[PDB]
Automatic annotation (TrEMBL), chain A:
Lineage, opening ranks: Bacteria, Pseudomonadati, Pseudomonadota, Betaproteobacteria, Burkholderiales
Positions annotated to bind substrate: 25, 259, 356, 383, 465, 473, 477, 523
Organism: Burkholderia thailandensis (strain ATCC 700388 / DSM 13276 / CCUG 48851 / CIP 106301 / E264)
Keywords in alphabetical order: Calcium, Magnesium, Metal-binding, Thiamine pyrophosphate, Transferase
The protein, known as: Transketolase
Site description Important for catalytic activity, residues in chain: 25, 259
GO annotation (BP), single: pentose-phosphate shunt, non-oxidative branch
Record text on subunit structure and interactions: Homodimer.
């Protein structure tokens, strides 16, 4: 059963599943068929029966629209993806969505579709493998050794994020990363040369990559040999595979309408004749299956690694335990107590610091407790305060390929690439990564935060300099809409702590839960608040009563809802409001997302139905309408900022006791 | 003796370190590092008139590295722009003309607003593209009126950002040879020595883009930088010039430099060596005379150039906009609002010669092109572009969006560019900066919800419409049909806020409108179907946008059969609706009549109109991969769910 027959198999499933769904992208799976045979048949180290096998090569389909390529490969090689599913391509609840989705389909390593990000994910996975290896291998016993393969097309290469990820990968000498490029002269608008005339080999050599240019992308033997050559490189490798889009189509190969549209029944019948593929839709003859199936080889590969690991466990019982725990993403055994100790510690200290500082202090405590902690900053380490006393900066080896182990990464000025890479580090397993930048620059990395939320993986994204409180850098740096815009992304937890204790709570919560988190810290100092034991336990509920009414008040009730640096203002507002006949309960809402997940009883306790509310936050006001209603009030900022000291701006922009009072009287009128 | 270049440069170092000391805030190192580059460019090559920063044929300068803003302030102050020393003393103070990062519109001679890295460079690319397009369009064999360079100062941060890749790759494919980038190659970014995280061979990278690179220029040798700029001007390719560059410390720097003068004191001869008013006036005078000769030979073109450089619409615009809108209403067509968008683009292009469209590799999907357009293309043999009015930007959303900002700043075109709505997350900060700059950039977004169907949750926007509404001063439109599309487009084109125009993949039903309703569409929110004149049924308001307006209209008779009388408010733009006066807003949404919002995106946004007691038919999860009709039923976009919600709200 020839490789033509094996490649053609991919062609038939891709074209027939697209036609069936009358939707999707047949051109790339047909263009890349032989590349598929080359990598998957002759090189990929994997086990269909266990797609969670720790030491498997990681494959990433960065050009995610060509998803039938992956579904064919998963199906053909014997993963648990039955033919029924490929028949249900692009149908509700199928295991075959239009773009591949992590957690939905076995063997799907990450979620792609937004261009460029799969490639950045793959850099993160290569970084994970390289870091773990440096960490867990011993001169007399290796348990970490796998490559990271990524398919990509012209789209990914035009996206800025390819630049960020490949520059970093080159500087970090990630030589087990191997990229195969669907080099076909085509993107969606037509002939790529009219908008994209890069000398791509030259670009990639400039990054410190090895490039294998001009491979015949329809020659299984040629691609195979190029991968072998890549596999022996001192540098990450780009393989340039010259292909024809929809190659094998009877009449439409190389056309500009095979990217994202069905071929039609007529072209499909004629393609069956030209290829000699005699089988009906979704019929695959057993000799194609026998040539593609990897269950046997997979079993052998993984059983071998198990023996390899068992021998490792004998010589290093403690490290083997740690590896298994970390690969599984399980926290230490004494977690609740150590986490409660970090929080108690902050509460005991009672210091008024910037929550960026509170953050660094929490990281100190997390690190002493989580060897898996992997920090980093997008060239703002000194500003974000993401590194800690005992941390080691990850660096490429001076002389050979690979990295020296470390646990804080300087990502460079690459917020988007850092964020996608973090998603890769997380998906790889073995570390608990986070990475920082200024809050406003969440606008550069936004879709990566989004993709973490879609995948439901606990990526942590740290943002500092969160408002006009940052002062003089001015309105291009001063976030106004950002905090609310991140809340709005489904499944993304947003924390904006008021003090050292809310920071400690936010971090330990984030490290321990399944949602990706944005942790949002201030530049400037925020007053410490004191809390009851009951209150300390309620911070983890996202919103809690920081200060209640006294039974002895018997004046007009209001609820002040505040977050982050504005908790101080709500708190300073209480007595002045009392002296005006208003009794103010202060609710601190460090995470509205976590608060919204609470039960109805708890939410009613904190925000009693029918008591009016004023929300206080140095951000856009409309967001708070969900808690304060049409009749409630908001003290916030609905314009861009200005360049001036923080104290000047806070006054200028009406974050004053006087404004809080004025608003409260207006709400209660 | 007249000022040496060393004294000319040290004047910059003095102002930078003194302004920073005065403000006790900011970064003196970058301006001080780039001072010689400043002298070489501004004093020897920059063509500009300090007395008129709006001279149409001026060279364009961009400080892409926003941190060294005292470099620019020094340069503007020294060469004679209207930026007094009292302002430099007021660095980083409230309402000064010397903000922390430079701001377009605040300070004369500031061409764009920079701060987030890489975007200035993308801005510059869009300005160079503007100059090349105008020239190809307007210059004649016997009379040239367009001819200027675009210069950008650049640092390591800018080069690491993915947006430099998008912008520089495009500039190199388009052979924008009048773009000249000068790179502060100092070995340093904020975290320390760049080599640990940025070890690019930047020269080879840029040659791979089709740029000319002059590597290894001594960043402190004015003559060397000068000659390097001179060479770049002879190049057939855009050029990158790689320039290798409190109290006690300031006092000792003064001594090390032999700068004897007190803070903010510039000696007369340094002023005289930097002043550019006299060369400026001559340059602009020469140009005004070359323009008079152009006007004598090409009077219609000359008036069109002037109108378009001011960004003024045609004098009978109100009639021409009304004809576009009326033709939409007359046609009564049920199509996707992406198709409605293309139809309006077509009518706009026939009356706006300045119209300049494009798409980030989604031309067919977004429908941004029109039948009479010409595609912008590099010249086959020489540098530069053949003129066109539709640009294939490649798969570069952020770079396209920042380039558009630069095209808008340059003057002469009315540009817009398209991509899918979710991919607004890639270009977001450029949307933000347009809104901060107050410039009428037009961003087109299509495929706006689960209505796109099978492509699935990575493409299906859910939070995007509401998250863009949050951005101050950015107008968001999500028209229900061809008439709301024509209104949104003609309003966006005519007004000063940047606009996001949000279009559906799928067919949306046309809605008939009375005259009074047609006149209210441009108010952003309006009554599309009102309650009967005297009724006994309980009242609800349905507020809907986009594709959901059809769902609101379909719910009205079913609601009436349940004893519920529904007003349908269409809200194509909540942002424009919020700028309406209190009387109008109360007329559309009367106090104390309860509301249900309907919109295929996050629900929380609507709480500002429907309150805690109101209702929302929306989606607060990600989508799924399935046909659009299957998804809409799956996600509860149904009359039955509208009725349930309305009854629960009315309870
Ligand atoms: Cl592709």
């Amino acid at each position: 059963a020839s490789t033509t027959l094996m490649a053609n198999a991919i062609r038939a499933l891709a074209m027939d599943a697209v036609q069936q769904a009358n939707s999707g992208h047949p051109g790339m799976p047909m263009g890349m068929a032989e590349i598929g045979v080359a990598l998957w048949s002759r090189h990929l180290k994997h086990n269909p029966t266990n797609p969670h096998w720790a030491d498997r090569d990681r494959f990433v389909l960065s050009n995610g629209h060509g998803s039938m390529l992956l579904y064919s490969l998963l199906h053909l090689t014997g993963y648990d993806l039955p033919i029924e599913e490929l028949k249900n391509f692009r149908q509700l609840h199928s295991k075959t969505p239009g773009h591949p989705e992590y957690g939905i389909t076995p063997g799907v390593e990450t979620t792609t579709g937004p261009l460029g990000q799969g490639l950045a994910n793959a850099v993160g996975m290569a970084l994970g493998e390289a870091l773990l290896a440096a960490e867990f291998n011993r001169d007399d016993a290796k348990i970490v050794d796998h490559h990271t393969y990524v398919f990509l097309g012209d789209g990914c290469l035009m996206e800025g994020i390819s630049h960020e990820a490949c520059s970093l990968a080159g500087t970090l000498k990630l030589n087990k990363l191997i990229a195969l490029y669907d080099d076909n002269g085509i993107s969606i608008d037509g002939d790529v040369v009219n908008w994209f005339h890069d000398d791509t080999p030259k670009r990639f050599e400039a990054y410190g990559w090895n490039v294998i240019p001009n491979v015949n992308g329809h020659d299984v033997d040629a691609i195979d040999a190029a991968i072998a050559k890549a596999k022996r490189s001192d540098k990450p490798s780009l393989i340039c595979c010259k292909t024809r889009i929809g190659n094998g189509a009877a009449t439409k190969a190389g056309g500009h309408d095979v990217h994202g549209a069905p071929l039609g029944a007529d072209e499909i019948a004629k393609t069956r004749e030209a290829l000699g593929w005699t089988w009906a839709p979704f019929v695959i003859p057993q000799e194609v299956y026998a040539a593609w199936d990897a269950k046997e080889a997979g079993k052998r590969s993984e059983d071998d690694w198990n023996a390899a690991f068992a021998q490792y466990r004998a010589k290093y019982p403690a490290e083997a335990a740690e590896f298994e725990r970390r690969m599984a993403g399980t926290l230490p055994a004494d977690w609740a107590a150590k986490a409660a100790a970090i929080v108690a510690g902050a509460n005991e200290r009672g210091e008024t610091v910037a929550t960026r500082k509170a953050s660094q202090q929490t990281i100190e405590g997390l690190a002493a407790v989580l060897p898996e902690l992997l920090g980093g900053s997008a060239d703002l380490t000194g500003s974000n305060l993401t590194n800690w006393k005992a941390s080691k900066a990850v660096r490429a080896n001076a002389d050979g390929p690979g990295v020296q182990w470390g646990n804080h990464i300087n990502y460079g000025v690459r917020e988007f690439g850092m964020s996608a890479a973090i998603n890769g580090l997380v998906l790889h397993g073995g570390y608990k990564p986070f990475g920082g930048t200024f809050l406003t620059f969440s606008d550069y990395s936004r879709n990566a935060l989004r993709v973490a939320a879609l995948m439901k993986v606990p990526s942590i994204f740290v943002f500092t300099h969160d408002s006009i409180g940052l002062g003089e850098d001015g309105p291009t740096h001063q976030s106004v809409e950002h905090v609310a815009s991140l809340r709005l992304i489904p499944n993304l937890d947003v924390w904006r702590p008021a003090d050292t204790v809310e920071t400690a709570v936010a971090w330990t919560y984030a490290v321990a839960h399944q949602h990706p988190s944005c942790l949002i810290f201030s530049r400037q100092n925020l007053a410490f608040n004191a809390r009851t034991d009951a209150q300390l336990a309620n911070v983890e509920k996202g919103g809690y009563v920081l200060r209640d009414w006294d039974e002895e008040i018997v004046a007009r009730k209001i609820i002040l809802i505040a977050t982050g640096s504005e908790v101080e203002l709500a708190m300073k507002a209480v007595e002045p409001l009392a002296q005006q006949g208003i009794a103010a309960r202060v609710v601190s809402m460090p995470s509205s997302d976590v608060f919204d997940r609470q039960d109805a009883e708890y939410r009613e306790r904190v925000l009693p139905h029918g008591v009016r509310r004023v929300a206080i936050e140095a951000g856009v006001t409309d967001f708070w309408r969900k808690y304060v209603g049409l009749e409630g009030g908001v003290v916030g900022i609905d314009t861009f900022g200005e360049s001036a000291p923080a104290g000047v701006l806070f006054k200028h922009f009406g974050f004053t006791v006087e404004h809080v009072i004025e608003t409260a009287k207006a709400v209660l009128a």
